[PDB]
Symmetry: D3
Subunit: 233 residues, 6 copies
């Protein structure tokens, strides 16, 4: 077992296919905070946080990463990158529980690029978010419609994140109409909706990453994850 607390710390697991990532990307202008990632086993892991702030900015996204995350390449054995036109199933399973106050979510974050050689400075072209928990928060962009995908109902949002210099990505968010602590999803169901139903995503693009974590806007609490996997088949 191990537990780490500095910015951008990584706890690898499953033969380095995944890592828990102490991602504090939104923290520069706030203080008073702490965030610790931990791994006891592959079925007992999570993170603990304290983000004292009332603002609507994301302070942090402690998370599990499979694939790329502004890294030189992709985690070993992850199955990323995978081109959408290859039509692989991207099967994910998670079971978790949160005890927290304030404003946060629990969400998948899926990154796409045009390149199959994403590196440390490769800006994504698109992000897909799948929120299993929304606690007092709301997504980027504008509400489109409610859809049934994968046996769940989702409110769909579409926006654009400007990352400076012409860098920036579409963001497509799927917010479950009620919170859930477990899901078994195929990311391909969501990318097929965006590509074939909405004509918002080209199948020439590559899925670079599947991440799962909690965006924290403010408050204190923790998550524990009791089941996790992402497999590209």
């Amino acid at each position: 077992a191990a537990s780490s607390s500095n910015p951008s710390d990584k706890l690898y697991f499953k033969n380095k296919k995944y890592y828990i990532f102490n991602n504090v990307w939104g923290a520069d202008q706030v203080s008073g905070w702490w965030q610790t990632i931990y791994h006891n086993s592959d079925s007992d892991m999570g993170w603990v946080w304290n983000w004292p702030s009332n603002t609507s900015t994301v302070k942090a996204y402690p998370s599990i990463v499979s694939g790329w995350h502004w890294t030189e390449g992709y985690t070993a054995g992850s199955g990323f990158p995978t081109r959408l036109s290859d039509q692989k199933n991207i099967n994910t399973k998670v079971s978790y529980s949160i005890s927290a106050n304030g404003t946060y979510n629990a969400a998948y974050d899926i990154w796409l690029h045009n390149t199959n050689k994403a590196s440390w400075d490769s800006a994504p072209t698109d992000a897909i978010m799948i929120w299993l928990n929304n606690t007092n928060a709301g997504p980027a962009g504008s509400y489109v419609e409610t859809v049934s995908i994968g046996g769940h109902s989702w409110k769909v949002y579409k926006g654009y994140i400007d990352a400076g210099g012409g860098k920036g990505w579409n963001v497509f968010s799927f917010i479950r109409t009620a919170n859930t602590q477990s899901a078994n999803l195929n990311i391909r169901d969501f990318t097929n909706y965006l590509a074939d139903s909405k004509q918002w995503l080209s199948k020439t693009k590559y899925v670079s990453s599947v991440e799962f974590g909690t965006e924290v806007f403010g408050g204190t609490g923790q998550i524990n994850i009791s089941n996790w996997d992402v497999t590209v088949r």
Copy 2:
């Protein structure tokens, strides 16, 4: 942004008109505790605490200070001291939220003296408290009556705090009949009630300070303040 954790630490803001004060005045005989003050912006600030104790003594009053607080003088630009007979409006606005357990309040603490040159050892003559939150607590002194002042209903209490050696002050507490997270008050409405309606306060006295904070008796939690000002007009 900044966040500090030692006893009596001060985080100044608004051109040093105010400071957040890590006031732990009641802590000498307890242990196991911590208290951190933070300022991200003038609309995003607060404090976090842990006071493990069951007793009815106030352990701490983390707070924002305007004016005097056992200091050589008064914060710059605060407008203190102001003599009650000058009849200035003392307009205060606060919006806040607490997430905590145990026993605590959220309260204004207004200090008065006979002297307009209050220094580090000048014992006040009177304290006025205005409680916007009461969580399992109760004030000093005895219940007088319920009054409507400033558009709110308040239970009024009157007591006396003995500070040793003949030092000591009246304490007049106004406890809102239900908790609220925001208020816009004129302290003059409260001092006029005490002076003109109850004949308990001379208008020869000076208001030395307006403070807002949480008296903590026991438990753990935090406050965040999203709006704050005190202006003497």
Copy 3:
């Protein structure tokens, strides 16, 4: 007052008749945790914890000890060891409150031996547990029946803890049918039930210890104890 945080720390009180014990016996394979014991007075003491884990193993039993606990002997003035056949009253009083999440209990743990000279390596023969709080947990062994003892109703369980090498003890657990924050019990009522009603305990055995604490499986929180004593009469 004092507050300590390392494994197996001890805070003695009442002329060393008792100690608060930072017992982390189940912690070897987990990380991310902390646990602090504190004593402000003999009527204001407790402990604070954070045990991030989903598993059904006991991580820790922060507790007050009277008597023996894998020590060379017994706390001074505790009245232990006492032979069951001497039929002494073992009167205990506790009042407490917990604020926590996760999975935990509040329980007496009473140790028995054949020897009246229990030492640091003397494996007990039996444990009796009396749970005043059960929060999402459950005991060792199998359910027997519900009984009224001492004015309370208890679900009774019987199991066996294997401690290796032939070492191991019976465990008899009494789980109150609803949680309570205070109790006045005579341990002799429980040992008489086990010995005379169930024929599960010989009165040749000695009571070595009476402990009270919280077994924590996972989560974060604290206890405060406002009344405590154990007296052998």
Copy 4:
């Protein structure tokens, strides 16, 4: 074993004849600091500190206390108070080691009063300090002379500490001419010098306390004490 870190925490030992005291009396106007007292056994105890400051004010005096220290009375079995005219031996033994930077001392602090019923607000009449270590520091008052007492050479200083309101005490400091890590002293040798040789102390006064600790002006480090006792015979 135990280790505590809040202001004014106390770790009692030797049947409460002594306590280690987390004395931070000079800390109000500084920040960034920490101080922890610990006791593993009566021959393995000490404290650890960090006092980031360049100033000549004493920030803290972590110490062992026997007798009184602004308390209602005197530690049990200490032998205090003892009237100087009763001519008791006050035998002290200490062995210690410091590893630190900055500015500090290791010093006995002996308090005297006119009253044999010193209470929590009883201002002393005199202090005697016996410095076994001086690291970049210097005492209150003015240099008198160098004397041989008890087999050691001491630079003697005489000053007066003003504690406000007419409260205040003489301070007589004996600074060893070279540092030492161990000493066996009889306080009566020092009070006899002050009374009979210098005519600076009346034998009507009572010794209220013998304390040993490190005054820290700035820096970080620790002390460990391997032998300690004070006995009035």
Copy 5:
């Protein structure tokens, strides 16, 4: 007094002309570290650190900033920006002491731009460093010569820092031939050497910032600063 420990925290002082800055720019790929900035007064301030690493990368530059530092503008009253062709004196005074192990320096860092409206994304054109302490370190670029400027001898180095995308700055480092704890310097003496003696700097450029801090490569320790000012005249 105050003391803060999160990345990029700021403690302003001197009417916000300066701030102490918890600058951890090189920390992304290391762990196990901490860094705290503190201010007791304008003559008693500093920082404490622990950077466990053997590598030659700068992990952090805790520092005092006057002027710009990837901010929207310049600190109030700093006197920045100032165009070199205006030939203002830029007088700096510092007195400090370090107690540390490992590899570090104590150095001024002076930033220049072509623009007098430097903003949060304005890459500098040049950096000038003035090292008062070198402990096991060495500068960027190549050694030029040893020069006497301002009454001190300096080893002069010239390099170029590539900041990506065409962004990047010359770096001119002046390393005192022996360490010193205090200096009174005029930055204009150094910019005149670079411009008029070496023809390496155009006087069309603006000085945007004067900073003083410790680049830490590895190790633990602290600095205390007892005198500080930067004035543009």
Copy 6:
């Protein structure tokens, strides 16, 4: 990078061939301590500690493990267990630096068993220690002689560690006659000396583990390791 601080935490590296181990085996009866293990890269790793105690007991052995350590089996790819009669080279390389006070060593710890299926409760038969640093410490057992092995001179000691119940192991310690920060050793040179020159070790035994770490008796400091490997060929 990662850094962990709880007892028995593990940071695996090199495809789980090794782990850094937060081994605090001697800590039960002391307090005031902390110990953190960290890994930035395979050439930048180490640990930081604070063990306030004067006693001659080993408090902790933060270390890198290859092979077994009271585990069910041996680290993957370590090459353990290896039977001495197979005469494999066991080549080790380390380069490190310590900055610390107090009493400690830097030492290899090599464990042997009769069994090639060592499990979590398999008591070793022998330990071999190779001390590259001795700071105020001394080994178990009695001095034999000084020998030249592998190009270094070593003081050789022989003792026996009683682990209870008949469990216990020979301990053979080789203490370099002067400290060194780097070594390239073949463990077979040391086991051949013990077996063939001294007739103290049977070649039927298996090497189960090669560990390198710092036994800490007391004090505070850190190690950094810049090169590490153990290979069985």
